[PDB]
């Protein structure tokens, strides 16, 4: 499972970094290029793929 992801907003490969703040149960995914940021709740079973998942889902939901 890759940790760096293509940004849904600027389509820059591996430009998204994921930070797991487990102490606060929050994952923050940020694109280095276009500076888009997204915050989602996470669990101890969560992974950066799950945070990027929640980001893609939030984008598609907001774009309806």
């Amino acid at each position: 499972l890759e940790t760096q992801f293509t940004c849904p907003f600027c389509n820059h490969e591996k430009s998204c970094d994921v930070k797991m703040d487990r102490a606060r149960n929050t994952g923050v995914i940020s694109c280095t290029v276009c500076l888009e940021e997204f915050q989602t709740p996470i669990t101890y079973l969560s992974e950066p793929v799950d945070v990027y998942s929640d980001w893609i889902d939030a984008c598609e939901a907001a774009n309806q």
Binding site: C10, T32, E36, A62, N63
Partner: protein, 365 residues
């Protein structure tokens, strides 16, 4: 100021004096707008703005969500408080909407019936403003970081496009020829800007820390390469003669086109003699930027002293171009400011930032 009016009436001073002095005074009194608002439609940060060059009424805005909004800036209502309503919108439901962020939008010069928009979806679309349909599309092998049409060309209608490829593309809007390219850069071309003075002069700034001026008619590469030191640290040209100590992510010719303002990721802005690329050594202090893409900043027009409005973190830093003296920080944005566009008719400013807001700065009183 009553002295200014009296001198204008009595012919002591040319009306030019009052006009430019009052323009400068208005720019100095720039503040968060007391009675003005801009309609919010972008779901993401605004990466670019462009007020049309003729009549200065309509404004384009490209968002990080790929939509393009067309606003009317005129206060067609009778109140002193108004919102710049959105006339048109390439929204998510448009058949030709950009799939990724729109990074540059530009009105066609000489006519408001057409505009262009380049996106990180590797497309430069040319839109008919009336029907609001794509008149043309140019596809690129790599994402577009910036594009620019010449604000002066009555003869040519080339769009200079800077992508992550090391080549500057020149797309002919006359019969569609995107094959022309300029060689000489080595990394992503983060900014491109045509000279407002010379028809065929194009300045290109790339991540290789170099800024090159090209005569696109010419067959022999770039005309000038900008050098910080002008020759103090001189070396055979393979890696020396850098404009900045980082990525040069913004270009802006001054109003007369005799100088060039380059902002780079070394936290420095520099002013260059546009005729021989010599550094004028104007200081400007430290200009904070860390943008990984092109940085859009503009200069004032029709004032006694020229100003440059540079995005500076979540603020707009206003500098005097030829002295470097820091005028002020326009402080009203909540995230990093991506673009600022200057309305020269009324010395107004419109800034788009990552907080999904377009803020209008108007002179006070």
């Amino acid at each position: 100021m009553l002295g200014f009016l009296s001198a204008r009436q009595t012919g002591l001073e040319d009306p030019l004096r009052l006009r430019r002095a009052e323009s400068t005074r208005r720019v100095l009194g720039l503040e968060l707008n007391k009675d003005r608002d801009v309609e919010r439609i972008h779901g993401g940060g605004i990466n670019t703005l462009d007020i049309e060059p003729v009549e200065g009424r309509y404004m384009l805005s490209g968002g990080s969500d790929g939509v393009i909004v067309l606003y009317d800036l005129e206060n067609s209502s009778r109140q002193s408080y108004y919102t710049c309503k959105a006339v048109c919108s390439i929204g998510r439901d448009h058949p030709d909407v950009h799939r990724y962020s729109v990074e540059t939008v530009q009105w066609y010069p000489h006519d408001t019936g057409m505009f262009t928009s380049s996106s990180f979806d590797k497309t430069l679309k040319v839109w008919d403003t009336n029907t609001l349909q794509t008149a043309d599309v140019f596809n690129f092998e790599e994402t577009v970081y910036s594009h620019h049409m010449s604000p002066v060309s009555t003869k040519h209608c080339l769009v200079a496009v800077g992508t992550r490829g090391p080549k500057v593309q020149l797309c002919d809007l006359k019969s569609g020829s995107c094959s022309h390219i300029l060689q000489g850069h080595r990394q992503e071309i983060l900014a491109v800007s045509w000279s407002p003075r010379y028809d065929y002069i194009l300045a290109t700034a790339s991540a290789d820390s170099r800024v090159k001026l090209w005569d696109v008619r010419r067959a022999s590469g770039c005309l000038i390469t900008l050098d910080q030191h002008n020759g103090k640290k001189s070396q055979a040209v393979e890696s020396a003669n850098t404009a900045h100590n980082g990525k040069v992510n913004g270009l802006c010719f001054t109003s007369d086109g005799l100088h060039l303002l380059t902002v780079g990721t070394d936290n420095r802005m520099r002013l260059w003699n546009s005729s021989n690329g010599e550094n004028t050594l104007v200081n400007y202090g430290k200009v904070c930027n860390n943008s990984k893409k092109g940085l859009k900043f503009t200069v004032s027009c029709g004032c006694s002293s020229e100003f440059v409005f540079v995005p500076y973190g979540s603020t707009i830093a206003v500098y005097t171009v030829y002295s470097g003296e820091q005028i002020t920080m326009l402080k009203g944005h909540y995230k990093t400011v991506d673009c600022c566009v200057f309305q020269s008719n009324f010395q107004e400013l419109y800034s788009g930032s990552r907080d999904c807001n377009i803020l209008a700065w108007v002179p006070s009183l």
